């Protein structure tokens, strides 16, 4: 019998960019419209039921982060679906500010184009009634309007130029808030388990927990709803660990290994 | 925000048809699980069906009170969900709500539409 | 072809006073159950789901209980608008079936 955790995977083929990373497989995303493209899944790396450290579980799609238990009834995925739903919705409050953000420049760009064919239609009067209807210092006062406009637009192509730069750099930025959010849920998944199973399970390094007890359907969702019983199964626990006064040699194959339980373990799994 | 409203009820006569519609409006970060739900004035609710997005072949749910004779459905290119009803007896005579869950993964209905009317007499 | 049997269909009880609702379901259910409370002429507003998690904006009297078939749902103390009427939901395999639901009133 052993539980695992886990994480979501799927067939998606969206990439977001983080700063340092580009052309990243997320299992979900959010288009935002002018090439910013915002990770809100995370990283899709699909796959002897292996936890989290080299996959992800394309059969779980009840949510993102859950278990996989296995015992004498039976075997099944099962979302976390109080951590999923708080990582959807903290997650949404943040990509909801962007939105806002964007609007407010959009609300911008608009308020400006209106003005500015505002000022054209008001120049070309101007260059009409000083034909068709002192004059002369009227004159250099309009070409002057006309100059200090041109120096307006050079002034709104500089702000745009700057705040397109601002705005996929923030996408970069929270893509990697986002990601890096993600591995830190599931992380907390593993330590609440790996507290209460305490030693009555062997941790197994690849995500999962074997444990040294036969832990049925009912005990399982003791682990998960965090009501685990440690004492319960204390004993036959502490038996099954002594059941298995120098130690004996490593596997000679060019790895590397670390002395853990009373058997040889890979270095390159810690 | 992210907000629901129902269209399309009205007056039909028994035996009839009627097509209401469900007009997401608001960045939604997904509009997938979209269920119609009805319920008859002082009477409790009742669950009809779902279509999911073409992200996920556009498949359908129902009950086995309405399967057949209802068929939800969404437009092309249009964002709206649809519910075309045919052969109304009058126990349909209800409210029809859409609703669906925030997010990606059906754990609740959280947003919901003010509903429409449906009245089915001669 | 899962029922859910909400009871109990009506409660009478003054202002603080804890109400608790069960809802049992026919077939195993597991966690996939929600919580709603809907105000006369309103749309249903979604409470628990996850059988035990509260919807964000929602306040901490609020509380659902239970796994498997049998799940709560208390009030820890009753205020004004409280006393509107609750459906519990099941989503965990279609048809996602409502309960009965159950009218709340005030003890005058």
């Known amino acids: 019998d052993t539980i695992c955790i886990g994480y979501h995977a799927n067939n998606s083929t969206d990439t977001v960019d983080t700063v340092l990373e580009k052309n990243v497989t997320v299992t979900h995303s959010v288009n935002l419209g002018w090439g910013l493209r915002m990770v809100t899944g995370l990283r899709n790396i699909p796959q002897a039921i292996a936890g989290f450290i080299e996959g992800g579980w394309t059969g779980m799609v009840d949510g993102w982060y859950g278990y996989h238990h296995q015992n004498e009834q039976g075997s099944g995925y099962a979302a976390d679906q109080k951590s999923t739903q708080n990582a959807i919705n903290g997650i949404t409050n943040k990509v909801n500010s962007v939105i806002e953000k964007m609007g407010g420049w959009m609300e911008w760009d608009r308020e400006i184009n209106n003005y500015t064919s505002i000022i054209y239609s008001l120049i070309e009067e101007s260059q009409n009634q000083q034909e068709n209807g002192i004059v002369q210092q009227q004159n250099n006062l309009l070409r002057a309007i006309e100059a200090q406009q041109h120096l307006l637009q050079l002034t709104v192509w500089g702000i745009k130029q700057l705040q397109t730069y601002n705005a996929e750099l923030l996408v970069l930025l929270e893509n990697e808030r986002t990601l890096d959010f993600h591995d830190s849920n599931v992380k907390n998944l593993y330590e609440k388990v790996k507290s209460q199973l305490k030693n009555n399970a062997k941790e197994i390094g690849n995500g999962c927990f074997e444990f040294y007890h036969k832990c049925n359907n009912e005990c399982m969702e003791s682990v998960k709803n965090g009501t685990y019983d440690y004492p319960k199964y204390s004993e036959e626990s502490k038996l099954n660990r002594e059941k298995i006064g120098y130690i004996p040699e490593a596997p000679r194959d060019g790895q590397a290994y670390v002395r853990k339980d009373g058997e040889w373990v890979l270095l390159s799994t810690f | 925000e992210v907000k629901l409203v129902e269209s399309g009820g009205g007056l039909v006569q028994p035996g009839g048809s009627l097509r209401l519609s469900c007009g997401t409006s608001?960045?939604?970060?997904?509009?997938?699980?979209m269920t119609w739900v009805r319920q008859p004035p002082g009477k409790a609710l009742e669950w009809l069906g779902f279509?999911?997005?073409?992200?996920?072949?556009?498949?359908?749910e129902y009950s086995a009170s309405v399967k057949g004779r209802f068929t939800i459905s969404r437009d092309n290119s249009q964002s709206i969900v649809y519910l075309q009803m045919n052969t109304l007896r009058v126990e349909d005579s209800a409210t029809y709500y859409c609703?669906?869950?925030?997010?990606?993964?059906?754990?609740?209905?959280?947003?919901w539409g003010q509903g429409t009317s449906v009245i089915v007499s001669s | 072809d899962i029922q859910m049997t909400q009871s109990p269909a009506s409660q009478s009880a003054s202002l603080g006073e804890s109400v608790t609702i069960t809802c049992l379901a026919s077939?195993?259910?597991?966690?996939?159950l929600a919580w709603y409370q809907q105000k006369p002429g309103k749309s249903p507003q979604l409470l628990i789901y996850?059988?035990?998690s509260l919807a964000d904006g929602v306040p901490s009297r609020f509380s659902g209980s239970g796994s498997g078939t049998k799940f709560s749902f208390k009030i820890s103390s009753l205020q004004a608008e409280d006393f509107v009427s609750y459906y519990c939901?099941?989503?965990?395999?279609?048809?996602?079936?409502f309960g009965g639901g159950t009218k709340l009133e005030i003890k005058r």
């Open positions: 609703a669906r869950p925030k997010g990606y993964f059906p754990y609740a209905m959280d947003y």
């Open positions: 608001g960045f939604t970060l997904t509009d997938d699980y």
């Open positions: 279509i999911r997005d073409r992200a996920n072949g556009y498949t359908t």
């Open positions: 077939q195993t259910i597991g966690t996939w």
């Open positions: 996850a059988a035990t």
């Open positions: 939901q099941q989503l965990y395999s279609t048809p996602w079936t």
